[PDB]
C-alpha cells in the first residue's frame, strides 16, 4: 500500500503478511456474509491496484464469485473509458500517462505507474477507484449468497423475539447489501412474520414504535 512515513513524504510499503492471512481467513470462515465487505475495505486501506488484485487472487475457493467479480470489474472499466477517454499524444519528458480502465484494475499498469498516479499533485487515486468497483461486485455476490428471502423469515413459536429480530435484519442486510430504504418493509413484514402470540402484542403497540420499545414489550 501507500502510506505516510515519519517524514511527510508518501512511500510504498509491502503488503503485510498479517493482512494477507487475515483476508484469506475471514473469507474461509465467514465466506460472503455481508460484514465481509467492511472487513475488505479496512484491510485494503491505502492499497495500490496491485495490492487489491493480490488480496483477491490469494483467495483459493469461491471461484464462481471471483469470475463474477471479474465481469463486474470489466463492466466498470468500460464505463470509465467511456466517461474519461484517454487523450492521445506523445508523452512529455517527466509527465505521466493517462490511466485507462485496465490501468486502474492493475492489468496493464506497473507498480511504479500506480504509485505515480496515487502520489501526484493532484492525485489520481487509481487505488480508491478500483476498490469501489470491487465493492460493487462484492455487494452483488453477498446478495446472491443470501440464503433466505426476507419473506420467509418468520418467528417460531418458541423463538425469543430478540433471536427472530436478529435473523430478520441479518437477512435484510444481505438483500441489497443494506444501503436501502430499510423502513417500508420494516413497518410491515417484521410484524406480519412475527409469531402469533407476539403478533397480537406488536399489533397492540400502536403507531410509532422504536425497535427498543417493541423488543421490551415482547420480552
Amino acid at each position, epitope marked *: 500500500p501507500i502510506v505516510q512515513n515519519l517524514q511527510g513524504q508518501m512511500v510504498h510499503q509491502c503488503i503485510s503478511p498479517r493482512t494477507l492471512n487475515a483476508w484469506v481467513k475471514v473469507v474461509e470462515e465467514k465466506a460472503f456474509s455481508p460484514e465481509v465487505i467492511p472487513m475488505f475495505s479496512a484491510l485494503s486501506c491505502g492499497a495500490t491496484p496491485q495490492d487489491l488484485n493480490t488480496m483477491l487472487n490469494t483467495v483459493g475457493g469461491h471461484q464462481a464469485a471471483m469470475q463474477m467479480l471479474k465481469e463486474t470489474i470489466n463492466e466498470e472499466a468500460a464505463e470509465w473509458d467511456r466517461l474519461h477517454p484517454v487523450h492521445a499524444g506523445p508523452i512529455a519528458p517527466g509527465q505521466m500517462r493517462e490511466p485507462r480502465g485496465s490501468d486502474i484494475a492493475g492489468t496493464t499498469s506497473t507498480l511504479q505507474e500506480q504509485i505515480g498516479w496515487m502520489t501526484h499533485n493532484p492525485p489520481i487515486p487509481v487505488g480508491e477507484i478500483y476498490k469501489r468497483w470491487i465493492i460493487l461486485g462484492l455487494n452483488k455476490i453477498v446478495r446472491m449468497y443470501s440464503p433466505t428471502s426476507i419473506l420467509d423469515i418468520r418467528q417460531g413459536p418458541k423463538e425469543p423475539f430478540r433471536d427472530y429480530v436478529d435473523r430478520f435484519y441479518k437477512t435484510l442486510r444481505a438483500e441489497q447489501a443494506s444501503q436501502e430504504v430499510k423502513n417500508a418493509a420494516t413497518e410491515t413484514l417484521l410484524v406480519q412474520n412475527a409469531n402469533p402470540d407476539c403478533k397480537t402484542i406488536l399489533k397492540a*403497540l400502536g403507531p410509532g414504535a422504536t425497535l427498543e420499545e417493541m423488543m*421490551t*414489550a415482547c420480552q
Partner: nanobody
Amino acid sequence: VQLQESGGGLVQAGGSLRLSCAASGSISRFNAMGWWRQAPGKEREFVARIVKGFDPVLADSVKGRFTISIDSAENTLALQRNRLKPEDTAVYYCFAALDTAYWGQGTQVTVS
C-alpha cells in the same frame, strides 16, 4: 391472573377525566401496558402506551392533551384525559403486555 377494566362514565365538553384498569397481581410486573378504544362505526383506535423504562407515548390525536401514569400499588393504569373533546366518545379497552397480549372488558365513554 385476571383482568378488569374500570373508570368510565359521563362528562361534559371541556371537562377532565381519568380512566383506570384493574389487573390481578402487581401491574409493574407487566412489560408494557396501554389503551385502545372502539367507536360505533369508526375502526378500533390506539389510545395510550407506557413501555417499561421509557417515557410514555400517547396517540397523536390526543398526544398533546392527555397524560398517563402507573401506580403498581393500585394495579391501575391512570390515563388522565385533559382538554377533553366530544370525539373521545367510544368504548375504551385497556391492554397490558406480559409475555403471554391482554385486553380489558371496555368502558363506554360519552363526552357532552
